[PDB]
């Protein structure tokens, strides 16, 4: 039913997701900044500014939205599987307004597994180590060309309207004869 009807552009923009090659490199960089587990938390607490400054992926819908509004997120990942879509439907426009690059990635479960949660629905990097600055800049350029640079044209395009298998054959038959 969701594909037979015409999809408004605000929702239709989520049909485009990051391709396999660049998504694999995206998760490779994000897997280097996993949040500390509870087991790692225990060892840190008993040792204790005796600890170095941490670097980790920022997650949480309310937390990430605030980071974007304060010009602190360098790259934002957006899940395309949020059933209450209104929770995340405004993020591409918010990131475009604030100049924060974004990518619609496939799998809220996959985002969760890098923050030790069942689902995450959003992820962001605010500060990256020096040895990974070049990798992040390479990913941002590739990601920008797919989502940020095409935002103006995608906002004008409606989705959906696909006919069923049998209805498609009936229409094609009438067009030919």
């Amino acid at each position: 039913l969701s594909i037979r009807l015409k999809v408004p552009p605000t929702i239709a923009q989520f049909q485009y997701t990051l391709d396999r090659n660049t998504a694999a490199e995206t998760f490779k960089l994000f897997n280097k900044y996993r949040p500390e587990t509870a087991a790692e938390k225990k060892e840190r607490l008993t040792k204790e500014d005796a600890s170095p400054k941490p670097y980790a992926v920022k997650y949480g819908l309310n937390h990430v939205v605030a980071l974007i509004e304060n010009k602190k997120a360098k790259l934002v990942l957006i899940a395309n599987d949020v059933d209450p879509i209104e929770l995340v439907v405004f993020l591409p426009a918010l990131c475009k307004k604030m100049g924060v690059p974004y990518a619609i990635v496939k799998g809220k479960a996959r985002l969760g597994t890098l923050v030790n949660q069942k689902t995450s629905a959003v992820a962001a990097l605010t500060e990256v180590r020096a040895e990974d600055e070049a990798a992040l800049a390479k990913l941002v350029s590739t990601i920008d060309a797919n989502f940020a640079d095409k935002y103006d044209e995608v906002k004008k395009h409606w989705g959906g309207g696909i006919l069923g298998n049998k209805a498609q054959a009936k229409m094609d038959k009438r067009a030919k004869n």
Partner: protein
């Protein structure tokens, strides 16, 4: 705003030494803020326009602003809300 001192007339009432109470923060309930102005502007460009708002825009361009208020009063309630809606549509037309 001073009382006259007699029981009848424009400023009737007794003269007392006046004091200025501190303003109550509840009197600013409907005051716009930087946070809420940013959100409402962003939502407008995402959601777009309502079907009755599109008809109002056409009437302004094609049938004048006066008839737009008459239609806006019917779709909305009071006449005062129609005037505010028409002015909002004028800004949308101007910024295009």
């Amino acid at each position: 705003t001073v009382k006259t001192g007699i029981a009848i007339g424009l400023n009737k009432g007794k003269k007392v030494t006046s004091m200025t109470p501190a303003p109550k923060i509840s009197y600013k309930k409907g005051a716009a803020s930087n946070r809420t102005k940013f959100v409402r502007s962003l939502v407008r460009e995402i959601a777009g326009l309502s079907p009755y708002e599109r008809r109002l825009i056409d009437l302004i361009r094609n049938s004048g602003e006066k008839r737009a208020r008459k239609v806006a009063k019917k779709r909305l309630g009071s006449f005062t809300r129609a005037k505010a809606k028409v002015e909002e549509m004028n800004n949308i037309i101007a910024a295009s």
